[PDB]
RNA sequence: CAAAAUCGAGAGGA
DNA sequence: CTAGTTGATCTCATATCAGGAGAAGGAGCAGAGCGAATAC
DNA sequence: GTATTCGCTCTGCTCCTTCTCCCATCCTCTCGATATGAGATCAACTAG
């Protein structure tokens, strides 16, 4: 449930940040979600 | 605490699941089908074992 | 001489000595020969039915219809036990025949090559069993045969059995197949049936499975639902329209005021365990393998034969006047002896029963202990022995009990000779309690007969007698009628291990029957 | 949490039947002899015995019918053996 | 006169 | 020579994410050069 | 009749995607999981 900005050196992404997201309760298992910026109109 | 409870999670779908199975077959039958039958308890107990 | 459709002459003496329905029989089966196309004769045991296929062949061979002119070198597939009757009778009806024998009995005395090389250059009716067919599948099939017809042969009912992939290999489309009884288990066998006789009509076997097994055989249950015996009503209805043309089923109900026969009976005796027999049971089905079984661990084989065992006698445990197998410890053995008294003092001729070979050893001795005259028959005996036991057994009124084991006691043998049937033990498949109870009521029967099949009550054998109930309920739901009553008698579970001792048309008809089909 | 979590499983041919759970037991741990006979078992006899310390899991369901007409009635069968919690 | 299985997991030692 | 018995064998039948590196194969583009082919 | 193209071929360059192999040696221990018989043939008897 929070905000993780990493960046693989060896990749075709500058950044992805993810977020675990997971109900508090135990209803199902995390579901992830990425946010990215493709690399270098 | 978390891990006991990922296991009785997946194992409780399962028995649900498996009960769903069991009532269904003697429903199409036409028949009423006991609980007692249809809960396979040991589905919890030697999962967790 | 009898002058059919198109130039089939059969001889008028030899027509002349054919009841109705068996000229009737007669002229199907040429109709048939006339597409093209193979055919079972569903008449019931003992209606008669190698003199049918004998009168058409010999009317065929005698028209010289048009490879071949009139009669190619046909083959027949019989059980060994009515073999020489099969020759007796080809020597009897039409003695022009050359009927040669590919057995190790045989007439030959060279290499049977050689006889069924002889035989298809000659035109000659060679006969054999299963196993040389299964044996020489190669050689039989090489030589351009006329007719495969097969006696008996439900023996086929098993699709993958290598006799069947056997005898699926002849090219002919004349295929015949003898049987009063051409479904015994379940539709598969019909299916396996219609694949030898017509590949086609039927489709492949798992659709035939989904279209029809399932809709038809789920329909009878006790539990089925209204809508869903509606279904398998109109499938049975159906597959009955599909598969007419090719059976030919007459019973012995229609045809008994025209063929004289006397009266039949059909009591079943519900017999009662004896205090150590009881005890054996009780013990048993109190054992843990019966309760390992219940629980799936083990194959269900051992428990149902030892079940078995224990209801014929108890043999497991050998317990003078004690012997092994001494009549008075199984209460069978004592109603046994009691008929045999009556009927020894009614001067009457028994025919004694038995599935298993060592329960009919113990009967033969019971019976040496007694004076009563017998004469036994089984697999063991010599099959050239065995038509001439028929012989003499129909020949002298002696013999008062006559023992037989099931599978070769049944399967066409003519006992007319007999008066009293008794069937000492139940199977799994009702067909060979029918053949075996059908070996005395025949063409020839001049003596009321009636018959006496032993069930020990709240055993086993009752739960057996339960599944061939149903059995006859599933087959009567297709060859005689689909309005077949639901068999309720028992829902047919795995507690039977358990003992409960007692004490051209116009367009508006083909609209309105398919609109009939379609609202069941 | 688990158990009133999982939804209930509505299946009919009609007949329905969603079979609704609602509370949870736990009886302290306990051992049934061959016979069958429910005793109280001490870790030192577990590990004596090689068997396993464990306590048997209770739910009370709540079955309901549903077929037509209203003709509801709910069927409660109390302390329903669910499994063995170690 | 030689009697005493295999496959996976884990913890260790130098 | 020649019928009867004994064993072995075989068939059928019974229910119910935090690898990587290097080779191989095909892909798509790019231009060179030569057959004919228009055309001055 | 030779420029002139030109289309077609024929390499052949990159460039990507696919696939396939490899990962120190030796040693000790524990623990959990992983039928039954009827019948027919045939061959050797087993005697006549
Ligand atoms: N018209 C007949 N004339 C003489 N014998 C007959 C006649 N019809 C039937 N039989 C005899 O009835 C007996 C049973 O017939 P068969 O075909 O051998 O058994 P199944 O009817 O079960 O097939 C046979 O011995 C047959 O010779």
Redesign the pocket.
Known sequence: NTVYV?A?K??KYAYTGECRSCLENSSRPTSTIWVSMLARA | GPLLAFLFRGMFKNLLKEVRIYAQKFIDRGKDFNLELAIKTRIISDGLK | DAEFDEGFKVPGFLFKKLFKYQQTGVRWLWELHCQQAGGILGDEMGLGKTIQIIAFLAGLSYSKIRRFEGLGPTVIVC???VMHQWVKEFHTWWPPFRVAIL??TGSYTHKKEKLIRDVAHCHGILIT?Y??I??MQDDISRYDWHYVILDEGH????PN????LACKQFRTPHRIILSGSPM??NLRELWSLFDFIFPGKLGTLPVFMEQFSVPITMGGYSNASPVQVKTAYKCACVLRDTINPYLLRRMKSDVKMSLSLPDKNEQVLFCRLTDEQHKVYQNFVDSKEVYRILNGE?????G??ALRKICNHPDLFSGEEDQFGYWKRSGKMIVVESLLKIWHKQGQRVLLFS????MLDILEVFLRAQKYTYLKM???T????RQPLITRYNEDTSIFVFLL?????GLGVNLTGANRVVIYDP???PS?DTQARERAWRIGQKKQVTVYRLLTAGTIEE?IYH?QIFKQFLTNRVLKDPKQRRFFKSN???E?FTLTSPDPLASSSLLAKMRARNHL | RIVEDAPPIDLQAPPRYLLKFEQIYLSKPTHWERDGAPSPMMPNEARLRNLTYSAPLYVDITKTVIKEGEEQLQTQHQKTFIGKIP
């Open positions: 990493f693989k060896d990749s | 059980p060994t036990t057995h190790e069993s196993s040389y299964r044996l023996k086929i009912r098993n059995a290598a006799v069947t015994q288990n083990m194959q269900i084989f051992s149902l034969i599935q298993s070979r060592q089984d697999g063991t010599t099959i050239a022995s084991t099931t599978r070769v006691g199977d799994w498949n060979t739960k599944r047919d579970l795995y039977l």
